[PDB]
């Protein structure tokens, strides 16, 4: 794979694998969106749905021109989680932590 592809895969794999001090993998709920037929209410509220599987697809298929474009999709995923899920819920808080994990992984891997 090209250098940018390896860097993006390392960044997103770091985010997906991140665990809190209890050993819980925070990305678990964000890997795969519920289907439109099972939870249409999600798609009525969230204009541009995205999950980590879709971000991995966009890295795999060379859709992100820059790390800024990848960051935009990660921040969109976290924005969608905060929009749909209750403030203070574990999912909402986890999405805030993952925004920080992404920024840290990006700085470490891309230098």
Instruction: Tell me which residues touch ligand A1A1O (CB under 6 A).
Output: 29-30, 32-34, 39, 42, 51, 77, 80-81, 84-85, 91
Q: Which is nearer to ligand A1A1O, 45 or 110 (CB)?
A: 45
Any idea what DSSP says for residue 28?
G
Closest approach, Cβ 8 to ligand A1A1O, in A, equals 18
Of residues 104, 107, 106, 97, the one with CA closest to residue 77:
97
Question: Is 101 a known ligand-binding residue?
Answer: no
CB atoms within 10 A of CB 18: 19
59 is in an annotated binding site: no
Smallest distance from ligand A1A1O to CB 3, Å: 28
Based on CB atoms, which residue is closest to ligand A1A1O, 39 or 110?
39
**Alpha carbon distance, N-terminus to C-terminus of the chain:** 19
Residue 10 vs 43, nearer CB to ligand A1A1O: 43
Spatial CA neighbour of 105 closest among 77, 78, 70: 70
Rounded Cα gap, residues 69 and 10, in angstroms? 15
Give binding residues for Zn(2+) as ranges: 62, 79
């Amino acid at each position: 794979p090209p250098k940018l592809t390896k860097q993006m895969n390392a960044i997103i794999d770091t985010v997906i694998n991140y665990k809190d001090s209890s050993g819980r993998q925070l990305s678990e709920v964000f890997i795969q969106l519920p289907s439109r037929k099972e939870l249409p209410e999600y798609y009525e509220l969230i204009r541009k749905p995205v999950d980590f599987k879709k971000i991995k697809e966009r890295i795999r298929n060379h859709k992100y021109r820059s790390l800024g474009d990848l960051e935009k999709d990660v921040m969109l995923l976290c924005h969608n989680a905060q929009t749909f899920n209750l403030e203070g819920s574990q999912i909402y808080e986890d999405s805030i932590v993952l925004q920080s994990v992404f920024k840290s992984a990006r700085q470490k891997i891309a230098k």
